[PDB]
Amino acid sequence: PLSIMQKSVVIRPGGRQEMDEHVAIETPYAIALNDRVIGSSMVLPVDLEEFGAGFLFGQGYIKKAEEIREILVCPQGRISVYADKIPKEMLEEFAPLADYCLPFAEIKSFIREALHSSPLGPQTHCVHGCGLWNNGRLQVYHEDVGRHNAVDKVLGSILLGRASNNSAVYTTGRLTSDMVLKCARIGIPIIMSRTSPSSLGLALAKRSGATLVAYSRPERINVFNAPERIL
Amino acid sequence: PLSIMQKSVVIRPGGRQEMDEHVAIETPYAIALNDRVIGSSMVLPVDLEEFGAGFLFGQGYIKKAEEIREILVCPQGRISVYADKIPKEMLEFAPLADYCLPFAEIKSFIREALHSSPLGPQTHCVHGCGLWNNGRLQVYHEDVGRHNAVDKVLGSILLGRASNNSAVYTTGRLTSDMVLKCARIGIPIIMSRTSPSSLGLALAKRSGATLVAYSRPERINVFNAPERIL
Numbered sequence A: 001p002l003s004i005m006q007k008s009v010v011i012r013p014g015g016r017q018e019m020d021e022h023v024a025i026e027t028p029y030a031i032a033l034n035d036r037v038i039g040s041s042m043v044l045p046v047d048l049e050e051f052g053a054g055f056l057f058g059q060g061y062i063k064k065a066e067e068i069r070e071i072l073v074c075p076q077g078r079i080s081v082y083a084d085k086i087p088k089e090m091l092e093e094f095a096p097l098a099d100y101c102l103p104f105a106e107i108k109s110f111i112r113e114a115l116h117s118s119p120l121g122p123q124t125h126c127v128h129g130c131g132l133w134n135n136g137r138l139q140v141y142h143e144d145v146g147r148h149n150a151v152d153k154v155l156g157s158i159l160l161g162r163a164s165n166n167s168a169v170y171t172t173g174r175l176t177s178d179m180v181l182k183c184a185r186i187g188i189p190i191i192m193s194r195t196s197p198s199s200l201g202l203a204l205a206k207r208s209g210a211t212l213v214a215y216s217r218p219e220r221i222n223v224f225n226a227p228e229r230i231l
Numbered sequence B: 001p002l003s004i005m006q007k008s009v010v011i012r013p014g015g016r017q018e019m020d021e022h023v024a025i026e027t028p029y030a031i032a033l034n035d036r037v038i039g040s041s042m043v044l045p046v047d048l049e050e051f052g053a054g055f056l057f058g059q060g061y062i063k064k065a066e067e068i069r070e071i072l073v074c075p076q077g078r079i080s081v082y083a084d085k086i087p088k089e090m091l092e093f094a095p096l097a098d099y100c101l102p103f104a105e106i107k108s109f110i111r112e113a114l115h116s117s118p119l120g121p122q123t124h125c126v127h128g129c130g131l132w133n134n135g136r137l138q139v140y141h142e143d144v145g146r147h148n149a150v151d152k153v154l155g156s157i158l159l160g161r162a163s164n165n166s167a168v169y170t171t172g173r174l175t176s177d178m179v180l181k182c183a184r185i186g187i188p189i190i191m192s193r194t195s196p197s198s199l200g201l202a203l204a205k206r207s208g209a210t211l212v213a214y215s216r217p218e219r220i221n222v223f224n225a226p227e228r229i230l
Helices: A050-057 A103-114 A122-125 A147-159 A175-187 A201-206 B046-060 B105-115 B119-123 B147-160 B176-185 B198-207
Strands: A003-011 A014-022 A026-032 A036-043 A069-073 A078-083 A128-134 A137-144 A167-173 A190-193 A211-217 A220-225 B003-014 B015-023 B027-033 B036-043 B068-074 B078-083 B129-134 B136-143 B167-169 B189-192 B211-217 B219-224
Touching: A003 A122, A003 B198, A014 A122, A014 A167, A014 B198, A014 B219, A026 A050, A036 A050, A050 A069, A050 A137, A050 A147, A050 A175, A103 A128, A103 A137, A103 A167, A128 A147, A137 A147, A147 A167, A147 A175, A147 B003, A175 A190, A175 A201, A190 B003, A201 A211, A201 A220, A201 B003, A201 B015, A220 B015, B027 B046, B036 B046, B046 B068, B046 B078, B046 B147, B046 B176, B068 B211, B105 B129, B105 B136, B105 B167, B105 B211, B129 B147, B136 B147, B147 B167, B147 B176, B176 B189, B176 B198, B198 B211, B198 B219
Parallel strands: A026 A078, A167 A190, A190 A211, B027 B078, B167 B189, B189 B211
Antiparallel strands: A003 A014, A003 B219, A026 A036, A069 A078, A128 A137, A128 A167, A211 A220, A220 B003, B003 B015, B027 B036, B068 B078, B129 B136, B129 B167, B211 B219
């Protein structure tokens, strides 16, 4: 289950009408590494294997796909990861990013396929989404109530070999510091948003070399760094 | 200094075009309590006294405005609070104030909040949160993070600068922590331009707080306790 039907009263100057609404589900999950609870988050309860891997990578517990042995999801509120908010040491030298470059012409298809991938946003207006594009195709697309979680789910995909870092990432969320940082650390070279960057977001993209695209629309984009990757 | 000019490159199928943009400032601050750093946050660096106090309330350290003695703000990234991320004791309610909002003032409240600062229209990168009572906008705060904008409002109430006997409006979604914070300080009417989550709505139901979503000048969707709308 990802949403619940709920009644509201719409009030206007003329009067009051009852109405049916879709309301997105937000729910706490604990994240455990090798049977020890590392943390906890409010999540949209979908794609939680991916969420688990990506959250631990974001916190700095895991660095490579290869360390992950298995991940179990319990509907009681636990994701258990088995392996062999940002830390201070993450903010401060970036390894090289992938060589993917984005044909400007596929931008309309990337954005269309992303926005059309799930009906939850049109229904609930309470979820962000994040996807990866390579080879003229939307490889994966995750939503969550929190934009940082949706990105974590994208990272978890890469870490579980379900997607490649040789990709463009699009998000409906703002490209603040933590959002860019996650993408840069896993090696994604093109980071795109429907909306704005922060100054720290921008400054991380400049340090890493990453292409950062804002205000993305099907046939218009504002590139703030490395516009060479847009073909 | 709340934004910065940055060169952008606008690209269309027709061609290309340089441009200047204005980008909201996001910068880290440590919050200390009686000289121990309790935590750190990325903020918009305005109304930081309010932020320090409301951050510590939201975290469960401060319970009353009376506990607060002094707050020192160091513009190189520390707010130091002197007093005598969601907690679990907060989530699992004392009475709320008895303000009720006249429907006709809703347009005034939204217009005023939305016209209060140019940062949103400049940068598209900040959330706002305001309080309304006595036919006027008593305070309005902005931040890069919706949770922080609310923390600032909490901070004003706690600093004697605003009343909990008010309706609150935010541009952010009414997810769990947003509702929890406002209900914990006693605010009876909690409104957003946008949507609630299920846990946000659960908390409103438990506290008895009026929860209003998809708020427009002349149309609101009330999900709990519509009687407080006059």
